[PDB]
Amino acid sequence: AKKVFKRLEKLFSKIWNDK
Numbered sequence: 001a002k003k004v005f006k007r008l009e010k011l012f013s014k015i016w017n018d019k
Helices: 005-018
Strands: none
Touching: none
């Protein structure tokens, strides 16, 4: 339970930044 899940959401913001 490292809650890295947050990093995953951060990677999603990067997609909207490249789009």
